[PDB]
RNA sequence: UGAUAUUGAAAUUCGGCUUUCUAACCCGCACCACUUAUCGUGGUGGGAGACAGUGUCAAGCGGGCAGUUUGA
RNA sequence: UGAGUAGCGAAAGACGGGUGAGAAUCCCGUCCACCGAUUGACUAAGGUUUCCAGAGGAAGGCUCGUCCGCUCUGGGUUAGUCGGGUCCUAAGCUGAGGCCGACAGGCGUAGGCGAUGGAUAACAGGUUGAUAUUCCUGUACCACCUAUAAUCGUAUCGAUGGGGGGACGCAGUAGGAUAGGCGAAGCGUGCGAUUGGAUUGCACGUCUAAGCAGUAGGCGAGUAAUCCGGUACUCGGGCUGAGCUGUGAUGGGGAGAAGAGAGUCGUUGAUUUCACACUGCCGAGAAAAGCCUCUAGAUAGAAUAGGUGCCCGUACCGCAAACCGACACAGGUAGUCAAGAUGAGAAUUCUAAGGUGAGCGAGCGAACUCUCGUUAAGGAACUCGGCAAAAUGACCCCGUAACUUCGGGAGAAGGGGUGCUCUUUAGGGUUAACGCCCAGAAGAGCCGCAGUGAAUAGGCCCAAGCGACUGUUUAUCAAAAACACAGGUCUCUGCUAAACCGUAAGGUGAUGUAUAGGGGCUGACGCCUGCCCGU
RNA sequence: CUACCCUUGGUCAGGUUGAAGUUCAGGCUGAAUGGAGGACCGAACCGACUUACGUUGAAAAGUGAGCGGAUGAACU
């Protein structure tokens, strides 16, 4: 039984990153968000 | 500067069994070279060169109650000399 | 044309191409090299139009389908045999030492002479323009275009017709049947192309076809009615609605689906 | 599919109909140059031509796709 | 409340001696037992201190706990030469300018990023409580610098540029090596206390990189930004690679026992390790750099010591109690190593190396349920149905039907042998025969109920429907008669092709061009496939 | 996770059958070499046909016993 969620640190970065959040218009918005709420941690 | 790139001597069984082979354990600044150490190493001893080995670590745990947390990452590189002799107590 | 014998019960009925006209050298020569990665979809990644996918790997050849270094004589090398094009294509030096690969007509020896432009040598061998070649040549891989390439004729076994003369352009017979005006500035090789019987062999197993880049394709009759027009309904089913429909509506047992007010509409009849 | 802008010149039947030429417009071709680059920008050379393509309006086709009705 | 109820997660332990306030559970000891193509050895993911030592026992541990992957204190990961960076590119990602776009932004040339691949210069021994191709004992290599220069001076570096090379698929056979395996006639030890024996009993039988030497494979003269490339006319064995062995590394290290400075042989079998090499096959099997060149252009001149060589990773777990599954969970997790007897084997049973005894137990030996084994006579009478269980089983020989698309059906059905001893004795290879392998054939003779005496190895036949077949499918109630399939036919489509995504460019189709490409229907093959012009 | 796909790698003990081609005796037949195939037994590995067990589970799909494919439309 090989259940969801095999982690892989380079697919982790990748996708959910602060780079590839900053690279998109909506990941900028994403981190705006998650600063707002002001969260502890942000991208990955 | 150099005197800044060396940080504490460092005290342990293992430092000690160093000190007996013309070995001397030296905790650094990080981002320092090997090399860096060694001149250091001269400018801070007027002793001079041979080997200058170097190793990183992680910054460990320890918890306070309630407050767990992490400690500063080291840097430690010990340093083994051609010729001289450092040493103060 | 190979014969297989049914040793196995899988593909008893195959047929191999004899390929004894491959002759001279087996590995391609190292002229041509670059290229192609494989994709079945478009840019953007979607599955645009494919029962598409899978087969082995190919290396590209660079055939110099153009015969623009018209003028110096050449001779074969060797015969070989292309993947990407159905028929084998002989390889070519230049007396300038230069080699090239071309498109290889039935016949051909080992050995060959014409070349490219300018002079009239009609028979067999490499495409000479345009408005010469006598009407009723045996004619191939012609030109739309003045130093295109010749886009027209090609595969393994193909021909065409060199009836007429118009002026302006020169009229021509596809093996299609159509007959219709190429611009009379065209390269147009002389015999017919390639392999006789390319098309006489029988594939025999499934999934020799997945060795080309061939996927299976599911009928339209089955599968789910968001699927298909012909999908949904209890067992075997009719079409149902009149004329049969492909995937994403539209009829398709029948209608033509050439361009309104095409471009090209007038240099052919 | 049609009127109409882009959109020109010149010849025939009665502003329409059918041909010809380019200064429009267009090449998912040849050459040059940017540039050690199949993108692009020009430059020529052909190709094609006032149509094609595009915007506006108009008439069809259109369960491909959508919102729904389908009584007590 | 249910209730002192269900449960306490596959598994073999017993005792003795310690420790301690307290032991079925901790440590030590003997024996016993389990895995041993693994429950062992090494690593990649992933996890991040779980690693180590000393202390502790409230909680975590399905019991206990003196013990812990838990707690407190202190400490552990050492590299020019291993993996990655300072090297190269693929898919893909990004994309200066640029083309498209209501905006937001999409696309894209040059170029850049990008390993799962190409290229890349060290080995062996030693050592701790925790590290080691990293520390040190020894012996090497690569790059660079600086000091001496035999030989060249309007030789030497050669390009981000054309050359060459790197550069490749899939199958199959034989052979050369090499590791590891097996037995003896040197060599360390012991010599029995249960009847017997003493050429008898057990244990071992090495050494690395580089660096010297030598060995199955592959194949010229001269003329037309360059003397190389390519192209063609006259003229009869050595250029490239290369497993591995001999030597020197070494008078070193290594080693077996024990009484307080010691051996390297011989025969034998023999790889999946060393060649995509070779051969055969068609489905026709990456790119770029390092490397070698030839010039374009640069620059005075380019074996013996000293010295220089950075960043990241390195602990521990890694078929698991430390990874993904909420758990110290009977599941999942790439790769490498893989010994003995037996065998065709990586099957089978028992054992090596090495690991483990499974985080509740003591009794009793009721029903009932589970997992095993056996059962008189009968033998499908059971049941929806032979479901389940039985029976079949290896090897050598003999013998095999209807049918058939001649391949097949076929292990058809079925028939016989199989153990140990002793003789004559005959093939294979290896060697001067000797002996070493492996292995038949005949004859007598022995013992048991039974001889592939264990474990592990096909039940078969007759007839019908459906589908030709291998294959695919509803992850988690359906594997089929369903989909696919090769074959067939219809239809579109002349190449900015049709069809298709975004209709914006851009892109698939396709670097293809009617022997091609899209869609519909049918679905091997055989014999065919008719009657009828509202939509 | 899963479905297709794109690059780039890796795995598949052992036995068996004997296609083409080639070679001697033949006017397309016996013997040898030869080594084909979505070929045949059968571990690794991949699967899920039957059954039993399990059903407030060891487990939110499993376990035992048998079973199918295993050089390929293979597995990852
Ligand atoms: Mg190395
Ligand atoms: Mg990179
Ligand atoms: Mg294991
Ligand atoms: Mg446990
Ligand atoms: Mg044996
Ligand atoms: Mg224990
Ligand atoms: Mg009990
Ligand atoms: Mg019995
Ligand atoms: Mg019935
Ligand atoms: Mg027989
Ligand atoms: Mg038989
Ligand atoms: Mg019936
Ligand atoms: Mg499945
Ligand atoms: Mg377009
Ligand atoms: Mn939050
Ligand atoms: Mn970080
Ligand atoms: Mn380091
Ligand atoms: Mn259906
Ligand atoms: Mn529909
Ligand atoms: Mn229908
Ligand atoms: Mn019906
Ligand atoms: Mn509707
Ligand atoms: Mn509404
Ligand atoms: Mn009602
Ligand atoms: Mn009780
Ligand atoms: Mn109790
Ligand atoms: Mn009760
Ligand atoms: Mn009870
Ligand atoms: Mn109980
Ligand atoms: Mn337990
Ligand atoms: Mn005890
Ligand atoms: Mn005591
Ligand atoms: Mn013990
Ligand atoms: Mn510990
Ligand atoms: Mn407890
Ligand atoms: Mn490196
Ligand atoms: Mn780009
Ligand atoms: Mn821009
Ligand atoms: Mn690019
Ligand atoms: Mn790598
Ligand atoms: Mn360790
Ligand atoms: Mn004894
Ligand atoms: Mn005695
Ligand atoms: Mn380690
Ligand atoms: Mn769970
Ligand atoms: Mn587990
Ligand atoms: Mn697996
Ligand atoms: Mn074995
Ligand atoms: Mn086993
Ligand atoms: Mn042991
Ligand atoms: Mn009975
Ligand atoms: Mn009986
Ligand atoms: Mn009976
Ligand atoms: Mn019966
Ligand atoms: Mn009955
Ligand atoms: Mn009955
Ligand atoms: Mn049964
Ligand atoms: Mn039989
Ligand atoms: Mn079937
Ligand atoms: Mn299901
Ligand atoms: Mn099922
Ligand atoms: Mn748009
Ligand atoms: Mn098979
Ligand atoms: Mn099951
Ligand atoms: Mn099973
Ligand atoms: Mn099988």
Redesign the pocket.
Same mark, same amino acid.
């Given at each position: 039984? &090989?259940?969801?969620?095999?982690?892989? &640190?380079?697919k982790?970065s990748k996708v959910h990153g602060f780079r590839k959040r900053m690279?998109? &218009?909506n990941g900028r918005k994403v981190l705006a968000r998650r600063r707002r709420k002001g969260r502890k941690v942000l991208s990955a | 500067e150099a005197r800044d790139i060396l940080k504490r001597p460092? !005290?342990?069984?293992?430092?000690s069994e160093a000190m007996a082979?013309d070995?001397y354990?030296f905790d650094v600044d990080?981002?320092?070279?090997?090399?860096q150490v =060694?001149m250091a190493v001269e400018e801070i001893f007027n002793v001079k060169?041979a080997?200058?080995? !170097?190793?990183?670590? =992680?910054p =460990?745990?320890?918890?306070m109650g309630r407050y767990q947390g992490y400690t500063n990452k080291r840097? =430690?590189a !010990?340093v083994?000399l051609?010729e001289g002799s450092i040493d103060l107590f | 044309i +190979?014969k297989?014998?049914?040793? /196995?019960?899988?593909?008893?009925?195959?047929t191999?191409?004899d390929?004894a006209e491959?002759t001279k050298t @087996?590995?391609?020569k190292?002229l041509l090299?670059?290229?192609?990665?494989?994709?079945?979809?478009?840019?953007?990644?979607? %599955? @645009?139009?494919?029962?598409?996918?899978?087969?082995?790997?190919?290396?590209?050849?660079?055939?110099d389908?153009?015969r623009?270094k018209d003028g110096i004589n050449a001779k074969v090398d060797s015969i070989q045999?292309?993947?990407?094009?159905?028929?084998n294509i002989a390889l070519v030096?230049?007396?300038?030492?230069?080699?090239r690969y071309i498109i290889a007509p039935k016949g051909l020896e080992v050995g060959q002479i014409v070349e490219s432009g300018a002079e009239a040598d009609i028979k067999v061998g490499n495409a000479l323009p345009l408005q010469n070649i006598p009407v009723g040549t045996v004619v191939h891989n012609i030109e $739309?275009?003045?130093?295109?390439?010749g886009?027209?004729?090609?595969?393994?076994?193909?021909?065409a017709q060199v009836l007429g003369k118009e002026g +302006?352009?020169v009229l021509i017979r $596809?093996?299609?049947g159509?007959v219709?005006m190429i611009?009379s @500035?065209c390269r147009a090789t002389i015999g017919?192309?390639?392999? $006789?019987?390319?098309?006489?062999?029988?594939?025999?197993?499934?999934?020799?076809?997945?060795?080309?880049?061939?996927?299976? /394709?599911?009928?339209?009759?089955?599968m789910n009615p968001?699927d298909?027009?012909?999908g949904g309904g209890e067992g075997?089913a009719p079409?149902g609605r009149?004329s049969?429909?492909?995937?994403?509506?539209?009829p /398709?047992?029948? +209608?033509? /689906?050439?361009?309104?007010?095409?471009?090209?509409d007038? %240099?052919?009849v």
């Amino acid at each position: 039984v &090989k259940r969801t969620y095999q982690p892989n &640190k380079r697919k982790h970065s990748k996708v959910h990153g602060f780079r590839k959040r900053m690279s998109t &218009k909506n990941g900028r918005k994403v981190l705006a968000r998650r600063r707002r709420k002001g969260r502890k941690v942000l991208s990955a | 500067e150099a005197r800044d790139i060396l940080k504490r001597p460092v !005290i342990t069984e293992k430092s000690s069994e160093a000190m007996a082979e013309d070995k001397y354990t030296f905790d650094v600044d990080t981002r320092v070279n090997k090399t860096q150490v =060694k001149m250091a190493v001269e400018e801070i001893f007027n002793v001079k060169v041979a080997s200058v080995n !170097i190793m990183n670590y =992680k910054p =460990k745990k320890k918890r306070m109650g309630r407050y767990q947390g992490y400690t500063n990452k080291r840097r =430690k590189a !010990i340093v083994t000399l051609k010729e001289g002799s450092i040493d103060l107590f | 044309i +190979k014969k297989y014998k049914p040793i /196995t019960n899988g593909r008893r009925n195959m047929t191999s191409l004899d390929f004894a006209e491959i002759t001279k050298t @087996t590995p391609e020569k190292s002229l041509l090299k670059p290229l192609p990665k494989k994709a079945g979809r478009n840019n953007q990644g979607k %599955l @645009t139009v494919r029962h598409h996918g899978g087969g082995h790997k190919r290396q590209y050849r660079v055939i110099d389908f153009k015969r623009n270094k018209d003028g110096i004589n050449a001779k074969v090398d060797s015969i070989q045999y292309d993947p990407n094009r159905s028929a084998n294509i002989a390889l070519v030096v230049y007396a300038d030492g230069e080699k090239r690969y071309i498109i290889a007509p039935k016949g051909l020896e080992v050995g060959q002479i014409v070349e490219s432009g300018a002079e009239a040598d009609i028979k067999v061998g490499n495409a000479l323009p345009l408005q010469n070649i006598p009407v009723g040549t045996v004619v191939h891989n012609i030109e $739309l275009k003045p130093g295109k390439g010749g886009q027209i004729a090609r595969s393994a076994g193909a021909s065409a017709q060199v009836l007429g003369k118009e002026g +302006k352009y020169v009229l021509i017979r $596809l093996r299609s049947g159509e007959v219709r005006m190429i611009l009379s @500035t065209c390269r147009a090789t002389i015999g017919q192309v390639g392999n $006789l019987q390319h098309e006489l062999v029988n594939v025999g197993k499934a999934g020799r076809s997945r060795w080309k880049g061939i996927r299976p /394709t599911v009928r339209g009759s089955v599968m789910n009615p968001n699927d298909h027009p012909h999908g949904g309904g209890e067992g075997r089913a009719p079409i149902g609605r009149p004329s049969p429909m492909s995937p994403w509506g539209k009829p /398709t047992l029948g +209608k033509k /689906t050439r361009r309104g007010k095409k471009s090209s509409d007038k %240099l052919i009849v």
